[PDB]
């Protein structure tokens, strides 16, 4: 997260960390959607050009975290994966279309003050909230700048970061990138003329873009941090997987498995 700020304790109880076993490193963010299911980006797990193809045994999921690096014995829970499901028509060849993946936990997690699932949107919610000019929130432990001076600059955050970003008109999203953007994506971020800044960055990928409904007070995951060109560049926008458009696949996987 670029130009964000420290999260409060328990502000994102659905935030999940994808932890690589060996070497120990932060892979990606993700979100909790029930006691046994985790949602993330497909490209966090599978990308054939860089021979990237992780496996149930290659990873740990860490739930309930505040600190990026501490083992928060009292508070976090660490789970192993039973199975990974990647959308069958995930297009890693040309534009990361359908960048979505589910993960089934080996055992269920007990909810607590620090661990709680986010809602997925229905048709009515998605139609009301996904409008240009409305703001959502992105959280993660990703980088604080695109680039920085080695062994001096900071770097990586020590606690979870949060930024609020506006959704941007489909025409402006299209004009800003030479990539073929589909209807399974939206873009968000501030326009050059607006004087605020903010973006996801390396390590935030797979984490949730959420919005709060003023009528029932619930939080809904509308997006997944997917791709962008650098971090917080002028005239550039972050692109997010469109969770509602892909809900039928989610529905199939959870029901059948």
């Amino acid at each position: 997260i670029v130009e964000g700020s420290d999260a409060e304790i328990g502000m994102s109880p659905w935030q999940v960390m994808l932890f690589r076993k060996s070497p120990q490193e932060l892979l990606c963010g993700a979100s909790l959607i029930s006691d046994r299911w985790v949602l993330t980006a497909a490209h966090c797990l599978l990308y054939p050009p860089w021979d990237k193809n992780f496996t149930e045994n290659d990873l740990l999921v860490r739930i309930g975290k505040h600190s990026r690096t501490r083992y928060e014995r009292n508070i976090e829970k660490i789970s192993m994966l039973e199975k990974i499901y990647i959308h069958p028509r995930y297009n890693w060849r040309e534009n990361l279309d359908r960048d979505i993946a589910l993960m089934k936990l080996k055992k269920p997690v007990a909810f607590s003050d620090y661990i709680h699932p986010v809602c997925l949107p229905d048709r009515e919610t998605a139609a009301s909230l996904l409008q240009a000019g409305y703001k959502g929130r992105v959280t993660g432990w990703g980088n604080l700048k695109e680039t920085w001076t080695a062994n001096v600059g900071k770097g990586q955050p020590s606690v979870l970061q949060v930024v609020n970003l506006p959704i941007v008109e489909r025409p402006v999203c299209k004009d800003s990138t030479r990539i073929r953007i589909t209807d399974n994506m939206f873009c968000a971020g501030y326009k050059p003329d607006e004087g605020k800044r903010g973006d996801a960055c390396e390590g935030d990928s797979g984490g949730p873009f959420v919005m709060k409904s003023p009528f029932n007070n619930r939080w809904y995951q509308m997006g997944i941090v997917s791709w962008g060109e650098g971090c917080d560049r002028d005239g550039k926008y972050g692109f997010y997987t469109h969770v509602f458009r892909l809900k039928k696949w989610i529905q199939k996987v959870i029901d059948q498995f």
Partner: peptide, 11 residues
């Protein structure tokens, strides 16, 4: 710079 976690989880 991660604190170490129980090695039962790292196999």
């Amino acid at each position: 710079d991660f604190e170490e976690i129980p090695e039962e989880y790292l196999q």
